[PDB]
């Protein structure tokens, strides 16, 4: 506001409380990473192919 011929601004304090669960989920993923795995079939040579 003008506030007696000035432009003092409103105080805007920030207390971030929504990042804790996001950090927990990210840590949960990074503790147990997953990747691609190839499964064999019912053949005489599928195991070596998968390996």
């Amino acid at each position: 506001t003008k506030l007696d011929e000035q432009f003092e601004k409103y105080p805007k304090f920030e207390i971030n409380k929504v990042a804790t669960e996001l950090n927990r989920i990210i840590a949960e993923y990074r503790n147990n990473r997953i990747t691609v795995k190839f499964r064999p079939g019912d053949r005489e040579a599928s195991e070596e192919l998968a390996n």
């Binding site: 207390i15 971030n16 409380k17 927990r24 840590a27 949960e28 990074r30 503790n31």
Partner: protein
């Protein structure tokens, strides 16, 4: 004698709680 307004006490308690709250399978639970 001097007095303590309730707004100041409320701010003290709220800020004290918020400082501890913001600043923090077993490993994942740790900060």
């Amino acid at each position: 004698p001097a007095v303590m307004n309730q707004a100041l006490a409320a701010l003290l308690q709220q800020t004290s709680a918020d400082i501890q709250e913001v600043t923090g399978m077993n490993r994942a639970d740790m900060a």
